Amino acid sequence: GRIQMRTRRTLRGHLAKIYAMHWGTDSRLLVSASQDGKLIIWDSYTTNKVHAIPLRSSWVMTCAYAPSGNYVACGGLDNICSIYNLKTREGNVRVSRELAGHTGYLSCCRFLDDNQIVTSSGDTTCALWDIETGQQTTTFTGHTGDVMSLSLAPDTRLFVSGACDASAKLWDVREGMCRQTFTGHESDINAICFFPNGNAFATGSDDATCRLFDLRADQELMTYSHDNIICGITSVSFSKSGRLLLAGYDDFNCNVWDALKADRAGVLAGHDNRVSCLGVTDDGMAVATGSWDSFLKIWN
Amino acid sequence: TEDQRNEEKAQREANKKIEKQLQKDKQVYRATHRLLLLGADNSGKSTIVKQMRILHSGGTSGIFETKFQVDKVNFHMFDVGGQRDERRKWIQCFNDVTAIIFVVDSSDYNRLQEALNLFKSIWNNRWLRTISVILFLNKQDLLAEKVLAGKSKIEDYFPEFARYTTPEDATPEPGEDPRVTRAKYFIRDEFLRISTASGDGRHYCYPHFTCAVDTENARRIFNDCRDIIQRMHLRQYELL
């Protein structure tokens, strides 16, 4: 009936707009990527910096933290995904591996394990790699527009992505062949995320609507909309239990829609520019966000 | 309470050190200015950037980052060539650059409408209304030759040129033909109409004439950056 939160904490030190953000499996630490080129690892529980990686290329659009909590992947408009060490015995963060082969700007990346990774790019394809040798093993194709999101399902065997054409497509990693496609939206996707049970998955759009789909479904479940809002959506998220949903908006604001309530509730306001990313801890003790105003305001 | 001792030691050793380093690096970060470059395939943008770099790249097979310096103020310029033709998404990564360099092929009248549409889209884009754009027109000498030969006359793509008249603002160059100036400033006004009709004070477009061989473009970009920052300062220091 009503939802509200305050800016519990704030992270300061980034010198430009934050484009990406990701935690680690250990919820106390989180990665952050900014156009300034710094992949700062912050100690969340004490709002402290623990590392400062100088990225090779300033134009970063992605950032990922390995499930083991050691390796961190970074990349963006340079068409390359780079890996670094954090828990190495040398005591200094250093490059471990670099992945190359895409023909478009890197859009998302996600670790599968300590020795594997999956990624999506703006060349209308997704790829799977081996960390040990840095070689491809399966490439995914079938979209028409740029791909701009990923959501590795908890059953990592399957994953889904959204594109700039009116379609979102599913791929099974070991088989490398598309097996479903939905097309309801009119102005197409910018983000996607999965449900803990894995059957349903959310999605953002350029038109002022959020929509839902499910694996068992061959139909667009629904679409949320508000009459007075024109701008688009920029990201999504889920709850620890998963029932409740959320998203980020273009007009310097968030807007919390819920599927179970099926209607919106409140807003997280306080940024003075676009919100470009979101995220929650693996344990759900805290929630974070990023913005083009360079503050990862962490909310109560 | 050895846990508290370890926490204090880790905090003191790590955060102080790396935050001192971070301030040191921020000092460098502010002093450096970053600019985006745009242009058509047949435009001279690659040649322009190469000339500036020679006047004094950080990547290949992707972003063609470049460095240059003027008046001991360090600059960065970025050319995104490692992407397919669709622009509407990756373009907004540059919403915070000081300015956007926009190059057009004025001799290629076929693309003049395409470049006009692209410039319209850039000018009215939600995330670029606050970012000044620098306009560059090239292959100007070919315009007179095209008028003489008329393989694809100006009127074929813009009949407004026939009814058009040279403006009082016109400043024909010393060794330049007048009617060629008429047509050249005519296309300039074609773009400036888009610039001004729906523009606002929070935006500006600076036209300039040049061929790729000209080295002054770095200083022009520098001076227009000065102008942009000066207006942002007027707004910031409460003079407006």
Epitope: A166, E186, S187 | R87, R88, N117, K120, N125, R126
Partner: nanobody, 128 residues
């Protein structure tokens, strides 16, 4: 599915013009910007006159200026075109197209190859 289907075409000659009718379906018509776009033998894509949202404003380029009749109608979700001063150059696939986002003047990629939001088009046989 988001699609724009065109109808009308065939026999044409100098001094004689057909009527081009477009059928937008499964997509909100008024609030989006509209515009034609053509492709002809031996050349790529070319821009054509537009009509703003709710049919407010119009624009043209030189080759087409003052010789074709652009218009939009909410009663049929259609654009219209009738030709004057017809030439063999009229032969082309008339892709009924629309801009990617609503309530905006941005139409970045309508001319882009493999652009999603455009129709199949129809052809006219200019002959004499």
């Amino acid at each position: 599915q988001v699609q724009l289907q065109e109808s009308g075409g065939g026999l044409v000659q100098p001094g004689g013009s057909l009527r081009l009718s477009c059928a937008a379906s499964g997509f909100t018509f008024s609030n989006y910007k509209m515009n034609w776009v053509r492709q002809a033998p031996g050349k790529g894509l070319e821009w054509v006159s537009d009509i703003s949202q709710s049919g407010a404003s119009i624009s043209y380029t030189g080759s087409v200026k003052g010789r074709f009749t652009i218009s939009r109608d909410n009663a049929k979700n259609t654009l219209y075109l009738q030709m004057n001063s017809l030439k063999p150059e009229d032969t082309a696939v008339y892709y009924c197209a629309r801009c990617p986002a609503p309530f905006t003047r941005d139409c970045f990629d309508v001319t882009s190859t493999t652009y999603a939001y455009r129709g199949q088009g129809t052809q006219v046989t200019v002959s004499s």
